[PDB]
PDB file of C-alpha atoms in Angstrom:
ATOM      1  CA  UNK A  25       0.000   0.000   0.000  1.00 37.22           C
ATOM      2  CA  UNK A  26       2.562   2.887  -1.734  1.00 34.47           C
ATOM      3  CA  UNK A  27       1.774   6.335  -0.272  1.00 35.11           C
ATOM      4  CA  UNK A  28       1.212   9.384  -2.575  1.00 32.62           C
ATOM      5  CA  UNK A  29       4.112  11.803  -3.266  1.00 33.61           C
ATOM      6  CA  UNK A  30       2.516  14.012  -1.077  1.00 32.82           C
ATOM      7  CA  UNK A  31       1.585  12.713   2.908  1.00 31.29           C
ATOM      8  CA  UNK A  32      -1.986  10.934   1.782  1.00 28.31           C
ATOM      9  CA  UNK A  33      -3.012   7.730   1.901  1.00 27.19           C
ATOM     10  CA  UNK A  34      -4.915   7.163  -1.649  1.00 27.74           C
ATOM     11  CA  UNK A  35      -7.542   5.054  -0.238  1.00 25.84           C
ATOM     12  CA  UNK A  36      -8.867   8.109   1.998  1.00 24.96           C
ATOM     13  CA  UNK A  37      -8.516  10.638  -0.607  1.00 22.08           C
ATOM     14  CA  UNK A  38     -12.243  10.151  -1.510  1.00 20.56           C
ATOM     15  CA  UNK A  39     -15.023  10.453   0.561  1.00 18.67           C
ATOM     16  CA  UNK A  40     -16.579   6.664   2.119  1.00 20.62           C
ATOM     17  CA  UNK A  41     -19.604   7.778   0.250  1.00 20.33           C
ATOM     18  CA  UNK A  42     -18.364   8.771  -3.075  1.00 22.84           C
ATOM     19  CA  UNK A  43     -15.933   4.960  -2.816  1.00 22.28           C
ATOM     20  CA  UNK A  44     -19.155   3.016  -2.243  1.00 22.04           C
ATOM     21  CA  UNK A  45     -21.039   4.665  -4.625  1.00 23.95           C
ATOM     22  CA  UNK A  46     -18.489   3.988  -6.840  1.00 22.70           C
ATOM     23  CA  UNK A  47     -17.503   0.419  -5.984  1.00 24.81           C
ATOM     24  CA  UNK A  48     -21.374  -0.017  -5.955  1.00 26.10           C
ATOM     25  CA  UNK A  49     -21.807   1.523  -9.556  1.00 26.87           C
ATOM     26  CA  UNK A  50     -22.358  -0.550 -12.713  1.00 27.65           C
ATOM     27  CA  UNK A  51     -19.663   1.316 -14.568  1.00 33.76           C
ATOM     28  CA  UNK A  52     -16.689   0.504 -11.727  1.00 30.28           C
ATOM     29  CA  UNK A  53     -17.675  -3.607 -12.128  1.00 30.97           C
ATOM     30  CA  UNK A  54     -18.272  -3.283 -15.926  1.00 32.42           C
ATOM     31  CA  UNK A  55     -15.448  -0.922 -17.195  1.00 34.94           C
ATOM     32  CA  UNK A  56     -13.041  -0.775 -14.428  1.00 33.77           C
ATOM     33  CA  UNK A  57     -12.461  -4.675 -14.013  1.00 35.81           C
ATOM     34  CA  UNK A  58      -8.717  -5.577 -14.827  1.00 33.07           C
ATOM     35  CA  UNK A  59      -8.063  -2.706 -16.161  1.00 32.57           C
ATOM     36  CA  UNK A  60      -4.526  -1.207 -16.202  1.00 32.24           C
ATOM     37  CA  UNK A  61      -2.783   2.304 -17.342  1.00 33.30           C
ATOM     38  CA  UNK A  62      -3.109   1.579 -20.801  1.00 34.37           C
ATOM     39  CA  UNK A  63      -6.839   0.291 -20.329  1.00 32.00           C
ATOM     40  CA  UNK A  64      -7.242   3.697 -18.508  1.00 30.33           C
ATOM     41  CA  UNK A  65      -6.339   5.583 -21.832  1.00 30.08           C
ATOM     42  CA  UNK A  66      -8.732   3.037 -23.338  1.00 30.61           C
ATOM     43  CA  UNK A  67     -11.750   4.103 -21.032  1.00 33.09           C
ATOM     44  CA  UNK A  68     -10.987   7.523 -21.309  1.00 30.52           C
ATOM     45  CA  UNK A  69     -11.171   7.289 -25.000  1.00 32.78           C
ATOM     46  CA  UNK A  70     -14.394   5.068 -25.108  1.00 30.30           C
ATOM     47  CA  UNK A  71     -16.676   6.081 -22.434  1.00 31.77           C
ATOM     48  CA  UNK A  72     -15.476   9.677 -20.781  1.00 30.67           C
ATOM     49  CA  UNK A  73     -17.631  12.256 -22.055  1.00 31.98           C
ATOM     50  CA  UNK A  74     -17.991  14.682 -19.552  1.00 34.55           C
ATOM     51  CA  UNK A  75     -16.137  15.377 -16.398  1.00 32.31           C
ATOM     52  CA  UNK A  76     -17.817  15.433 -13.108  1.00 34.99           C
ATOM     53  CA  UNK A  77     -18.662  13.719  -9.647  1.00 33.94           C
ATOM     54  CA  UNK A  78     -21.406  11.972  -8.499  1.00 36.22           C
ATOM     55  CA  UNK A  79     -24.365  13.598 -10.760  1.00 36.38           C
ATOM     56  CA  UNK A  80     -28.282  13.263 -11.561  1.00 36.79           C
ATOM     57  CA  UNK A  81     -30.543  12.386  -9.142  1.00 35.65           C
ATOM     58  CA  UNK A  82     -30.048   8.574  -8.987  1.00 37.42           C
ATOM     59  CA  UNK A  83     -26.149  10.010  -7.719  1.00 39.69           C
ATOM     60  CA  UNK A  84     -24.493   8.562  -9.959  1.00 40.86           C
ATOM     61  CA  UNK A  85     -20.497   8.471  -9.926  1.00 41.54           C
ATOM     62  CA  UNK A  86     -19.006   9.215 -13.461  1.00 40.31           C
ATOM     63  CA  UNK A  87     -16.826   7.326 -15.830  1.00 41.83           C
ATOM     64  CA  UNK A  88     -14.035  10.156 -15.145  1.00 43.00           C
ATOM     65  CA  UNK A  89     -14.708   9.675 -11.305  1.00 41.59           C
ATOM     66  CA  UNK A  90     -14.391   5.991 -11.344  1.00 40.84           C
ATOM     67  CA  UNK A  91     -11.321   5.934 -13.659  1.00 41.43           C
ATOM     68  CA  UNK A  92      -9.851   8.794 -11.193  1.00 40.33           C
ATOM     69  CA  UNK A  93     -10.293   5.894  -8.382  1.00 38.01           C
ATOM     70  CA  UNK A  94      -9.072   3.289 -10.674  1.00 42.00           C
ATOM     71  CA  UNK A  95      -5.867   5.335 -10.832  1.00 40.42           C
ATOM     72  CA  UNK A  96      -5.596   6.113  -6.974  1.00 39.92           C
ATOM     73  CA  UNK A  97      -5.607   2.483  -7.079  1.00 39.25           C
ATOM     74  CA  UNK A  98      -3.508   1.843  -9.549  1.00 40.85           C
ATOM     75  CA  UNK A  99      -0.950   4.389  -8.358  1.00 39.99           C
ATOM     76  CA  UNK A 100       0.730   4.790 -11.717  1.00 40.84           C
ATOM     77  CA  UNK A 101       4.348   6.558 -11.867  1.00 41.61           C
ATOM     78  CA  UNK A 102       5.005  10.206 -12.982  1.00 41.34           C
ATOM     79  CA  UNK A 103       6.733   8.959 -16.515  1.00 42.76           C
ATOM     80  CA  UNK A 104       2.654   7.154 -16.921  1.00 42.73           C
ATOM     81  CA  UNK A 105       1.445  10.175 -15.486  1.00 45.84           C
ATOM     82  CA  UNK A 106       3.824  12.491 -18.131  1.00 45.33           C
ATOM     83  CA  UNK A 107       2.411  10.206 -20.858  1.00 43.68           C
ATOM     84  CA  UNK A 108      -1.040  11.061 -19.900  1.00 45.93           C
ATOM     85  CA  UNK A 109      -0.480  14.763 -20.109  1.00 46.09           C
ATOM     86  CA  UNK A 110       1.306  15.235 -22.827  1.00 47.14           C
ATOM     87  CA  UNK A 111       0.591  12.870 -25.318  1.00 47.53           C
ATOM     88  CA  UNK A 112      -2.522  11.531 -23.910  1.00 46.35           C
ATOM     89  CA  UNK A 113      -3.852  15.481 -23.584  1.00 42.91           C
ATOM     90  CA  UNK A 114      -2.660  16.344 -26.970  1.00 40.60           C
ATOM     91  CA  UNK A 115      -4.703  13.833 -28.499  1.00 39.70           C
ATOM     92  CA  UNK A 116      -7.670  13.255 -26.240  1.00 41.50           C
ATOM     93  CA  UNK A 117      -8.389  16.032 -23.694  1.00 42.82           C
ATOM     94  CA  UNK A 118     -10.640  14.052 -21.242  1.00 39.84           C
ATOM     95  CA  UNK A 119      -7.461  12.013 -20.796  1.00 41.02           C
ATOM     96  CA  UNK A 120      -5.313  15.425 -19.660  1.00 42.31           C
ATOM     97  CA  UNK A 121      -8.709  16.099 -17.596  1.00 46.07           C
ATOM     98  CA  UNK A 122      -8.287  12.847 -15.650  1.00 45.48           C
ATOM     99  CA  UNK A 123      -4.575  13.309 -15.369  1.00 46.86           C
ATOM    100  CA  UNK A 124      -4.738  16.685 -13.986  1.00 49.46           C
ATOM    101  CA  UNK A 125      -6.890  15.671 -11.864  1.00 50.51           C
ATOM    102  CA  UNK A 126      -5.304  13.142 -10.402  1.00 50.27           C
ATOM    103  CA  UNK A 127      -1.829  15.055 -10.318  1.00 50.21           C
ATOM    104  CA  UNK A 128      -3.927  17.345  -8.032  1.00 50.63           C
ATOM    105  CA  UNK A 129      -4.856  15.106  -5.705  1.00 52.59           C
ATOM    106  CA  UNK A 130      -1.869  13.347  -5.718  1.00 51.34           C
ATOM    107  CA  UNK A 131       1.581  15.613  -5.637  1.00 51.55           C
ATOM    108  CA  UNK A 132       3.515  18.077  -3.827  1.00 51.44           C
ATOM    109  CA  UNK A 133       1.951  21.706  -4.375  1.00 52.74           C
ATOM    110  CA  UNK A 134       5.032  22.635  -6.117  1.00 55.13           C
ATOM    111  CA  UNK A 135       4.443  19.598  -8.504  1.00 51.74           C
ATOM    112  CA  UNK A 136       0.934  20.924  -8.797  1.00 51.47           C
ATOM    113  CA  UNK A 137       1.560  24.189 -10.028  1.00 51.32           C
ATOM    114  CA  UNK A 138       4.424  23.518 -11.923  1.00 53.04           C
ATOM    115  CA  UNK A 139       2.618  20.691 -14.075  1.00 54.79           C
ATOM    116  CA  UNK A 140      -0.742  22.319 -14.602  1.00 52.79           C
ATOM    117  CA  UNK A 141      -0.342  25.982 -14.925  1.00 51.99           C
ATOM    118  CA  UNK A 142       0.758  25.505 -18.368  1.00 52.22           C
ATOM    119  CA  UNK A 143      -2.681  23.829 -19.814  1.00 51.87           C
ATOM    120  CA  UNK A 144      -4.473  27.126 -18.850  1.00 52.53           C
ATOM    121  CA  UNK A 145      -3.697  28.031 -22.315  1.00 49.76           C
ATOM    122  CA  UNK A 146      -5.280  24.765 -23.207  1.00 48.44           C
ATOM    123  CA  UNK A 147      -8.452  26.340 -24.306  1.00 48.91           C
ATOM    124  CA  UNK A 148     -10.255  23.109 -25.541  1.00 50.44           C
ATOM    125  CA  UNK A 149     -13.980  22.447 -25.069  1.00 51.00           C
ATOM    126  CA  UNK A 150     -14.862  19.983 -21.921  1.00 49.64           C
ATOM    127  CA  UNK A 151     -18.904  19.139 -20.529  1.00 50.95           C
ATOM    128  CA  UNK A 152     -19.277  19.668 -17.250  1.00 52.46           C
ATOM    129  CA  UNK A 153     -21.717  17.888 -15.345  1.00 50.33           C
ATOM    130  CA  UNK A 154     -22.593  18.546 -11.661  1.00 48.54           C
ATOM    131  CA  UNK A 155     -23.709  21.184  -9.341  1.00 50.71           C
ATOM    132  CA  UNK A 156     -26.132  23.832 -11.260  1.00 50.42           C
ATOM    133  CA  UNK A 157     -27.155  20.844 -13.785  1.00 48.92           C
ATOM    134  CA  UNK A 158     -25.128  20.642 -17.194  1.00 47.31           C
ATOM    135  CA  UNK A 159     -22.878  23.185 -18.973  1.00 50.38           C
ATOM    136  CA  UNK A 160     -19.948  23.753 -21.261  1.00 50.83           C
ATOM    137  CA  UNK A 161     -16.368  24.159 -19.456  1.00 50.17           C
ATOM    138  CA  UNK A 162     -13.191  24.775 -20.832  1.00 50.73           C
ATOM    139  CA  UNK A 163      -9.417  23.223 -19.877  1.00 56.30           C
ATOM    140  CA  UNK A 164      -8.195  26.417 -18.649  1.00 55.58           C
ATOM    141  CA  UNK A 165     -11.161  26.341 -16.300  1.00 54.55           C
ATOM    142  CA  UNK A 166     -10.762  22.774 -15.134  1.00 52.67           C
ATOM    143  CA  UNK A 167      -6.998  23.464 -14.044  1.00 52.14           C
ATOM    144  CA  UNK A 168      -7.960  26.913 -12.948  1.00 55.62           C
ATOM    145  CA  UNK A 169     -10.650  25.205 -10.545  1.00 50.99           C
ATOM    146  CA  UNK A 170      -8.059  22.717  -9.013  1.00 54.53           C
ATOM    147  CA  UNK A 171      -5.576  25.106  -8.549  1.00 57.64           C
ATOM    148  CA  UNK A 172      -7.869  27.854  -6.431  1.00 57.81           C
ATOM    149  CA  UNK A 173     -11.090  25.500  -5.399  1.00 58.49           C
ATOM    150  CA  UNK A 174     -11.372  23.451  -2.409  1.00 61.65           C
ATOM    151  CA  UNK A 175     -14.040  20.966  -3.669  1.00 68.26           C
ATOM    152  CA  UNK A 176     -13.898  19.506  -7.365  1.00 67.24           C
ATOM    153  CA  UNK A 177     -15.733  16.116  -8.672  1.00 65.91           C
ATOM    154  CA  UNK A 178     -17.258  15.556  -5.093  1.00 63.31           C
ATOM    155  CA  UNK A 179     -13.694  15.258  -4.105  1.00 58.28           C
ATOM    156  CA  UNK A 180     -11.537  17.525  -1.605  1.00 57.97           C
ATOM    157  CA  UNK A 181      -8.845  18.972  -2.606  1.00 55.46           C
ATOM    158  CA  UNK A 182      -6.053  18.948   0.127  1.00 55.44           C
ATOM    159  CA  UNK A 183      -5.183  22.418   1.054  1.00 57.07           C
ATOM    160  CA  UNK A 184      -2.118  23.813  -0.671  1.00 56.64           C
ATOM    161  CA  UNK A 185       0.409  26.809   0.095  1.00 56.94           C
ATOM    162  CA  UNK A 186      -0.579  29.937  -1.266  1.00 57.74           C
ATOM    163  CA  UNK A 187       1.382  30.339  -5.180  1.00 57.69           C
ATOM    164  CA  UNK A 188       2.986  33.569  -3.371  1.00 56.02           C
ATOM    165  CA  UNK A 189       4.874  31.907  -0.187  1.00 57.56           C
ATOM    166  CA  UNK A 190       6.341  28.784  -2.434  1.00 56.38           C
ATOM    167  CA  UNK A 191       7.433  31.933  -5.087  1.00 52.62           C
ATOM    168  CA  UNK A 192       8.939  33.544  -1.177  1.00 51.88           C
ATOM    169  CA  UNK A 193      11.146  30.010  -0.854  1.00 47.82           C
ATOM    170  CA  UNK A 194      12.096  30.063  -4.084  1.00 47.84           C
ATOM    171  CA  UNK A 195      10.586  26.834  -4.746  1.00 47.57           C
ATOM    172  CA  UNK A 196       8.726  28.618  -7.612  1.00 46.51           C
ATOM    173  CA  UNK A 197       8.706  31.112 -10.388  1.00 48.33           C
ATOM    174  CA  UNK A 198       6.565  34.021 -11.091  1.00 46.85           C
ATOM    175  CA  UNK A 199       3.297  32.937 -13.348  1.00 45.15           C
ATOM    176  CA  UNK A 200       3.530  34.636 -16.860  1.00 42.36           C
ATOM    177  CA  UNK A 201       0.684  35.258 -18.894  1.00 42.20           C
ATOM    178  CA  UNK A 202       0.709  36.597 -21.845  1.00 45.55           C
ATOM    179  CA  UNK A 203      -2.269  38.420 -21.516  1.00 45.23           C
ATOM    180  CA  UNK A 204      -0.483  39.950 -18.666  1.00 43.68           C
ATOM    181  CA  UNK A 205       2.169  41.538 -20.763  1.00 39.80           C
ATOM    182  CA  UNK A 206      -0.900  43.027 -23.076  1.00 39.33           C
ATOM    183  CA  UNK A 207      -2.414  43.797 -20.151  1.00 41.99           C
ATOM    184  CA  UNK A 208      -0.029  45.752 -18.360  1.00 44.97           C
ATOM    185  CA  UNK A 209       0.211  48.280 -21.921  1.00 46.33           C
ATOM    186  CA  UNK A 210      -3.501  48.147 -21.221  1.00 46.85           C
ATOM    187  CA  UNK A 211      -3.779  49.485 -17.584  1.00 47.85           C
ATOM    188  CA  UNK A 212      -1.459  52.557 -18.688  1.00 49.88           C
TER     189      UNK A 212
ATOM    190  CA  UNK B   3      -4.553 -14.430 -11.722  1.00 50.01           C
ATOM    191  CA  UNK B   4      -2.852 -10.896 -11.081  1.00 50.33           C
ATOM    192  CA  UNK B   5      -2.609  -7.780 -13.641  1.00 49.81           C
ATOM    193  CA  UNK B   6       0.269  -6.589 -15.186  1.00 46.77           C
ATOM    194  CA  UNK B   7       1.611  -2.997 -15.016  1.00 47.83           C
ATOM    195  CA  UNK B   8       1.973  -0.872 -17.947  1.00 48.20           C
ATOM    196  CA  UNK B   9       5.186   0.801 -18.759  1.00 48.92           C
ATOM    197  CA  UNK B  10       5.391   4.015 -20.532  1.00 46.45           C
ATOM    198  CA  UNK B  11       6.236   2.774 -23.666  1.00 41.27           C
ATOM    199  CA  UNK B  12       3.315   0.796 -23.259  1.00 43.13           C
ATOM    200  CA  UNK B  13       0.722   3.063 -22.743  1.00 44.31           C
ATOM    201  CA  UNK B  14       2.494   5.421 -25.220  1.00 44.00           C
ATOM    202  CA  UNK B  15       2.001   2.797 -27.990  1.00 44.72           C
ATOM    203  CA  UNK B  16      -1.696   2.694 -27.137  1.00 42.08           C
ATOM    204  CA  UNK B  17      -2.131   5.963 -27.157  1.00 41.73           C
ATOM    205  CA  UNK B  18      -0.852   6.311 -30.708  1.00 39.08           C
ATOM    206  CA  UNK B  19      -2.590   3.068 -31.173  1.00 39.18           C
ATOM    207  CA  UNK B  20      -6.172   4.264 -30.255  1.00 39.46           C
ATOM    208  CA  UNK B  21      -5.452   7.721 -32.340  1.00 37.11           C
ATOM    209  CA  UNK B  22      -4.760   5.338 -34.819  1.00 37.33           C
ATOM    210  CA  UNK B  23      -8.096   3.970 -34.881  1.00 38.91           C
ATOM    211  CA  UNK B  24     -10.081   6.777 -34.232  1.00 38.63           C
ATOM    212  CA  UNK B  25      -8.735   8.591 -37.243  1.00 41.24           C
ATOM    213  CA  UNK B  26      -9.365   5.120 -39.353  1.00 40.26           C
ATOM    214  CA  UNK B  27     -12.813   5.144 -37.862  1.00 42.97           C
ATOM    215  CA  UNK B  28     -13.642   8.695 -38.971  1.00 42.54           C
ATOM    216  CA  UNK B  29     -11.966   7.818 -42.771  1.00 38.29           C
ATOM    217  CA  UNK B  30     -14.594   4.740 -42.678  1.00 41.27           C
ATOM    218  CA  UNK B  31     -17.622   7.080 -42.289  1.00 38.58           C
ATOM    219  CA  UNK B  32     -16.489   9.815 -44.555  1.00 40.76           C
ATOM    220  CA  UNK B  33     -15.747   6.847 -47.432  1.00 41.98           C
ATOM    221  CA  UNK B  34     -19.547   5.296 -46.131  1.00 43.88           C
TER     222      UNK B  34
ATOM    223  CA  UNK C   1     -11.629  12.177 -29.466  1.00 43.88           C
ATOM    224  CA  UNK C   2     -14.688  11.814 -26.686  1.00 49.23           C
ATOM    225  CA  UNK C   3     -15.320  15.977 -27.217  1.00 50.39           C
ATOM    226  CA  UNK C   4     -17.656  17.600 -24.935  1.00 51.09           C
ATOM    227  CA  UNK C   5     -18.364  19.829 -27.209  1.00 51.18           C
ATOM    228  CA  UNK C   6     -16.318  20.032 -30.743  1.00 52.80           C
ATOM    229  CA  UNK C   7     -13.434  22.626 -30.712  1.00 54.22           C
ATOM    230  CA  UNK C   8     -12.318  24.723 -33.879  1.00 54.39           C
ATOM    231  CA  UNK C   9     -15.233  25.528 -34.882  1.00 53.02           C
ATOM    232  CA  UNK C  10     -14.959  29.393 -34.619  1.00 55.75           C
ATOM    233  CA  UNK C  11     -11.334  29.385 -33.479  1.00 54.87           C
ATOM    234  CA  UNK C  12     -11.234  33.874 -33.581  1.00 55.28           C
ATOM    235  CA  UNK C  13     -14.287  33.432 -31.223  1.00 55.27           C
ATOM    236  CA  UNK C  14     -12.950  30.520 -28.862  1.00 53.19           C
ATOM    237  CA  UNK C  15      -9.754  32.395 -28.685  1.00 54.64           C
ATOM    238  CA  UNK C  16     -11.450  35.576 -27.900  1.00 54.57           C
ATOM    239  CA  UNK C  17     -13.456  33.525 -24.970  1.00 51.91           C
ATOM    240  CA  UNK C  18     -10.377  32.068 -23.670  1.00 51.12           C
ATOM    241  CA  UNK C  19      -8.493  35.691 -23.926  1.00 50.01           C
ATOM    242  CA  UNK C  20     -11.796  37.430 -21.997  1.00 47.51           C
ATOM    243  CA  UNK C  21     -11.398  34.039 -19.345  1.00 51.74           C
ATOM    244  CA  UNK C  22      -7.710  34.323 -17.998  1.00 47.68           C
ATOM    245  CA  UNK C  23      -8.178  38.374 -17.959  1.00 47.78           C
ATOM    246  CA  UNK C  24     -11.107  37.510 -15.433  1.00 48.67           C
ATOM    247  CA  UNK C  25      -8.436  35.431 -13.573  1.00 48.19           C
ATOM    248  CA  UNK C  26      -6.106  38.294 -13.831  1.00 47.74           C
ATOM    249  CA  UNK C  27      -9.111  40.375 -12.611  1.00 48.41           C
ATOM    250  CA  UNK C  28      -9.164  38.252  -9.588  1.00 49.46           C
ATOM    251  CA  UNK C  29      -5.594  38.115  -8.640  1.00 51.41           C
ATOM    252  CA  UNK C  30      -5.016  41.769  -8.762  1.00 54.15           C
ATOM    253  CA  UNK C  31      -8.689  42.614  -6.970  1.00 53.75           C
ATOM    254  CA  UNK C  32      -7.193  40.162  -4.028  1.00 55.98           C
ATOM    255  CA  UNK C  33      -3.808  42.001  -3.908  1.00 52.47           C
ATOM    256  CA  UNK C  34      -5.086  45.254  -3.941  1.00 50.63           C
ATOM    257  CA  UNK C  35      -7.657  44.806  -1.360  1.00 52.78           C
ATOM    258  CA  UNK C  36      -5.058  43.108   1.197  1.00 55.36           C
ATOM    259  CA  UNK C  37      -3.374  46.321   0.011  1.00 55.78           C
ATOM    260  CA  UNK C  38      -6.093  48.583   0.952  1.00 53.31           C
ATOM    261  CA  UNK C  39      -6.313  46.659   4.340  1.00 54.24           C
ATOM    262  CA  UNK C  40      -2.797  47.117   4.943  1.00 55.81           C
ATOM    263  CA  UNK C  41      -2.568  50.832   4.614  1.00 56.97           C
ATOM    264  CA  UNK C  42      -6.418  51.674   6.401  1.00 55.20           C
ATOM    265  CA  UNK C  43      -4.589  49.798   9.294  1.00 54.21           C
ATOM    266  CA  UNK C  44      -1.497  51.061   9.484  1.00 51.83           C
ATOM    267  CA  UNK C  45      -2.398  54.521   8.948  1.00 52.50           C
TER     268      UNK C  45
END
């Protein structure tokens, strides 16, 4: 029973709810049985089409929630993890989605930031299922939401160090957006 | 009765693999 | 490809949305600094 890079224990990442509602759910016995990294990508591609928790009223725990568990379970490496991201989210984005995601709940806060701050100029069209019913999301939104929200896909996100003290440590460098370079000609 | 691990290699391959496909799939119904 | 919704469709528009997104989030981050700002100098004198 490997621990995460970071100090928690991947079994009580999720709520005991959201696991039995999971381990409970057609989908997890179906889809998830003997399934592996590579049969991850192959779920991903075949049955994610929206990310999400639990949704609807029956509560039911989505494909992308289940195949999150399946990879807190699976525990795959950062190299897996790398593949995911880059050539995974290049070609399907539900896969970067998943791997963010994970990455999130998974890795040091410096990790985090340094990882997924670049995919907020991934501008790509995700659905977004959940609280308020069902709407149109973006990538850049996604990350954006794990890097500043405490709750995402009826998950909790473990609280990390605030961008500005790990920048104080030198641990991290200074965000740049290009719109801020616009934007600071645009302020003047 | 266990499962095997992937390596990256691994689930690079089926990544290209299932791109693979996808675009083959898409050529079938444009050619349908 | 599994899209949620299919991209490149009107790429000057979904540009344009992403552009008016991360100046919200830019929005955000200064508001927050300049309020602790505000804060800071109401307290101090």
């Amino acid at each position: 029973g490997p621990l995460a890079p970071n100090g928690l224990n991947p079994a009580t990442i999720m709520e005991k709810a959201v696991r039995e509602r999971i381990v409970e759910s057609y989908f997890w016995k179906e889809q998830c049985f003997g399934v592996n990294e590579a049969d991850i990508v192959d779920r991903v591609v075949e049955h994610v089409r929206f990310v999400g928790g639990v949704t609807g009223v029956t509560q039911k725990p989505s494909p992308f929630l289940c195949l999150a568990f399946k990879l807190l379970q699976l525990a795959p490496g950062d190299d897996i993890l790398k593949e995911y991201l880059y050539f995974g989210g290049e070609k399907f984005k539900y896969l970067r989605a998943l791997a963010a995601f994970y990455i999130r709940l998974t890795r040091p806060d410096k990790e985090v930031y340094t990882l997924l701050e670049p995919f907020l100029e991934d501008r790509r069209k995700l659905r977004r299922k959940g609280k308020n019913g069902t709407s149109l999301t973006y990538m850049d939104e996604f990350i954006d939401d794990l890097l500043t929200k405490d709750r995402v896909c009826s998950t909790s996100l473990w609280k990390m160090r605030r961008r500005d003290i790990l920048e104080d440590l030198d641990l991290l460098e200074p965000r740049v957006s290009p719109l801020g370079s616009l934007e600071d000609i645009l302020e003047e | 009765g266990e499962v095997k691990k992937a390596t990256a290699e691994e689930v690079h391959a089926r990544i290209e693999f299932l791109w693979q496909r996808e675009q083959e799939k898409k050529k079938e119904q444009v050619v349908s | 490809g599994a899209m949620g919704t299919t991209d490149d469709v009107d790429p000057e528009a979904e540009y344009a949305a992403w552009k008016l997104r991360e100046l919200r989030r830019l929005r955000r981050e200064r508001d927050a600094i300049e309020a602790r700002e505000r804060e800071l100098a109401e307290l101090e004198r």
